Design a protein around this ligand. Structure first.
Ligand code: HEC
Ligand SMILES: [Cl-]
Ligand SMILES: [Cl-]
Ligand SMILES: [Cl-]
Ligand SMILES: [Cl-]
Ligand code: NA
Ligand code: NA
Ligand code: NA
Length: 82
């Protein structure tokens, strides 16, 4: 539940319903996530913490516990397709 709330507050601006309005080829749905190896909590949490390209780093914005919770939410949603 907390993971979904964090996602709504911090991630849905760019990734609503698992999309990516900024970088077409890097969404949160099964195909792109599997291709890029975002298939574990740790893989996702590392990317969220440090940022990448035009995506900001969240390591100074969200706590480690919040990053874990949102990463689990994204993993579950991706694996089951949003
Ligand atoms: C727009 C300002 C964004 C917000 C808010 C968040 N993300 Fe993002 N994300 C964004 C871009 C431009 C990209 C591509 C970065 C690149 O590699 O060039 C991404 C990518 C991801 C990914 C990887 C998806 C994939 O490879 O298919 C993940 C797992 C991801 N973003 C997660 C995520 C979370 C959990 C966010 C809130 C804390 C979040 N993003 C915010 C743009 C934006
Ligand atoms: Cl981009
Ligand atoms: Cl990537
Ligand atoms: Cl990373
Ligand atoms: Cl940043
Ligand atoms: Na909410
Ligand atoms: Na674009
Ligand atoms: Na801070």
């Amino acid at each position: 539940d907390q993971g979904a709330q964090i996602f709504e507050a911090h991630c849905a601006g760019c990734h609503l319903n698992g999309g990516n309005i900024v970088r077409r080829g890097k969404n949160l749905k099964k195909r792109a996530m599997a291709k890029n190896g975002y298939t574990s909590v740790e893989a996702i949490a590392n990317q969220v913490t440090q940022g990448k390209g035009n995506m900001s780093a969240y390591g100074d914005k969200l706590s480690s516990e919040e990053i874990q919770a949102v990463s689990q939410y994204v993993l579950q949603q991706s694996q089951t397709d949003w």
